[PDB]
Each structure stands twice: as C-alpha cells, then as structure tokens.
Amino acid sequence: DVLNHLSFQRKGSDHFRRWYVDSRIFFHKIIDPKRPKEGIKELRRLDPRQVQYVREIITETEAGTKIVKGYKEYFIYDTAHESYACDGRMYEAGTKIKIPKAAVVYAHSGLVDCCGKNIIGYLHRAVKPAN
Amino acid sequence: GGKYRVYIDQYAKQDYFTVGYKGPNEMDAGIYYAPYVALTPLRGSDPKNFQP
Amino acid sequence: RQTGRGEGNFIIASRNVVNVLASVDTGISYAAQGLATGFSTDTTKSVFAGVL
After folding, report:
1. Which family, according to UniProt (chain A)?
2. CA-nearest residue of chain B to C40?
C-alpha cells in the first residue's frame, strides 16, 4: 500500500531525483482520525523552500541545562511568497504552520555544512565547477 | 501545590496579586482575546526618495 | 449530653469555616497550615466538602 501511496511504479524516479538534488524530502501524513486505523492514504510530497526543521529544549539545570533535553524535532511549513521561476500572485498573509514530527514522512542526506544543521545537496560539490 | 498557577507581572506598578479563574471550556474565562487577523507584513518603498 | 442518642457527626458551615479547615491539619499534632487542600472548598462541584 505504501509504495502504491507514493505511486512508486510511476513516480519513484521523481521522488528520488528531487531528494537527491535537494537532499530532503517530506510528505504530509494522512489520518482519518475518527477511525484512525484506516487513515493511511496516498501522501502529499511537500516542497523544499516551504519546509523547516525545528527543535526546542525544555528542561533546566545549573550553569547550563544538562538533563533530558527531549528536543521534539517538529516542522514548520507554509506557502507565502510562492514566486521565483514562475511569476506568482498572492495577497499578504501570515503563515508559519507547526506540524508534529509524527505527522510527516521524511528523509534526508548525511551532508551538512560547517556549522548548524544545514543539510546540503548531493550536487553541492558540483556548484563551484558547474558555474 | 498543584492547586493554582503562578505567574509574574514584570511591570507591576507597585506590589500586589490577583486571583483569576478559567474553566476547561475556553468560553468560560471571564476575559478573552479573539483575533481574526494577526502579524500580517507590509513591504515596499517610497519613489519620492525610494527609501524602503 | 442533651440527647442521649450519640454525639455530633456532621457540620454545616460558611465557606470561611471550611477554607480554614482545608488549609490546616485538623488531626492531633504540633502545628499545621498551608494551601486549602484538605476539603473541597468549592460549591461548584459539591456541597459536601469532606469528613473532618
């Protein structure tokens, strides 16, 4: 059911390609939820540039917090300024939607920059010489 | 003691406390804030001097 | 004394006389006070506060 949900047989190549290029892929996870047991359905791949990974520490000790820093690790996702390679139109609106970690299917590369947790593309190596 | 929530008014004018109540029913609060629009950005520049 | 049927076994009292019990240890002891938790002091959920 899962590979059919992803339409793997027609789109596996596209999902993989976007992931390779961007190094992050996400899908919105579906649930009924009145009859949650039957809720898994074809998922919605989410766009890069609209998604951000966010974690928070809630716990405290002396001279810095050194106890169960659970982090949560949830996501933020929005629309907003959907205009770049396509000249888009929209009005002004606030967005910033918070999505539970459990609510999203996602994978990413092991390629990270010098600091932080900024995940980079498999093509990152090629940017210099490509240009 | 698990009985009442304790909060601080960092701008209290002098020294004092107030006791409130809020029920499980969000409507049952005495006082409420009810937004329908918030924090919506505005951006551009003024051509008379083109400053943002 | 005056009845010959048994000693008092219930109390009906103002809220103030219940709050004062809820906040203290009414058993036999040295000293005792704090938050009003021993009895319900509300009227919203019951009338019966508890057994002293």
Report:
1. Belongs to the Tevenvirinae portal protein family.
2. B3
B24 near C CB under 8 A: no
Chains in touch with C (3+ beta-carbon pairs under 8 Å) read B
Q: If you measure CA to CA, which chain B residue comes closest to C36?
A: B3
- Provide the experimental method for this PDB entry: cryo-EM
Q: How far apart are CA B26 and CA A129, in angstroms?
A: 59
**Bridge pairing between strands A104-108 and A97-99:** unpaired
How far is the C-alpha of A46 from the C-alpha of A76, rounded, in Å?
11
Distance CA C25, CA A66 (A): 39
* Long-range contacts from A110-115, C-beta under 8 angstroms, 24+ separation: A111/A23
DSSP H or E segment with residue A25? strand A24-28
C-alpha span between A125 and B29 (Å, rounded) = 58
Chain B residues whose C-beta is within 8 A of a chain A C-beta are 38-42
